């Protein structure tokens, strides 16, 4: 039910499995060998992306689960200028 994401800089992120299945690459990572079917952690070690981009993509996962199709006054997503051009690569790598 809960999946674990580890950033390259040691930082861990835990979010709902439904929240992290909105990205195709993470869905592939959970599938396949080493699924670690303990149903509690399913940890994945992102060896490249830093901590802040992983925090931002977890925020995005929750943001898309909450507002997938509802509340047509959709809130804007606060991309910082410094975190941009690095979250784009992360989103591409995760196929969000």
């Amino acid at each position: 039910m809960y999946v674990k994401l580890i950033s390259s800089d040691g930082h861990e992120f835990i979010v709902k499995r439904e929240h992290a299945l909105t990205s195709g690459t993470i869905k592939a990572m959970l599938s396949g060998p080493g699924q670690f079917a303990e149903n509690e952690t399913n940890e994945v070690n992102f060896r490249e992306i830093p901590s802040h981009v992983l925090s931002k993509v977890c925020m995005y996962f929750t943001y898309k689960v909450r507002y997938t199709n509802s509340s047509t006054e959709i809130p804007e997503f606060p991309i910082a200028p410094e975190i941009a051009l690095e979250l784009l690569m992360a989103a591409n790598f995760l196929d969000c």
Binding site: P33, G34, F46, R47, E48, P50, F93, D95
Partner: protein, 131 residues
């Protein structure tokens, strides 16, 4: 490092990828850390400057799949009496390996194959059909 496109040596990355996917297709127990690092290496291969290696990686993995299917074909041909049971076991192993290869090669499937060519899971099944 990071997700920045960095010049990566094709030989060593393709060697470690070859080892781990010939472990996966043969259903050898692969480590989860090595698995996620292999998604990392796959992303590096399809992106690295100055020229993307997607064509090179696709050709190399087609060669690997072709020779692995040839090895299985020889292995089942030399087993004359038990051709059916051996074929069934190798079919289960290769079907699971093809699904896991489709999962691992998702970046080629969504960035290079569809952007003609044909998918890695489809390539594995076509190689299995042809050889």
């Amino acid at each position: 490092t990071s997700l920045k496109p960095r010049v990566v040596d094709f030989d060593e990355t393709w060697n470690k990828l070859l080892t781990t996917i010939k472990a996966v297709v043969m259903l050898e127990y692969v480590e989860r850390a090595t698995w996620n690092d292999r998604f990392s290496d796959i992303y590096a291969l399809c992106v690295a400057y100055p020229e993307p290696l997607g064509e090179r990686l696709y050709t190399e993995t087609k060669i690997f799949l072709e020779n692995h299917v040839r090895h299985l074909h020889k292995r089942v041909l030399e087993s004359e009496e038990q051709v059916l049971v051996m074929y069934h076991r190798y079919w289960e192993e290769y079907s699971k390996g093809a699904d896991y290869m489709d999962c691992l090669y998702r970046y080629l499937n969504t960035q290079f194959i569809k952007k003609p060519l044909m998918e890695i899971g489809e390539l594995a099944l076509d190689m299995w059909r042809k050889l």
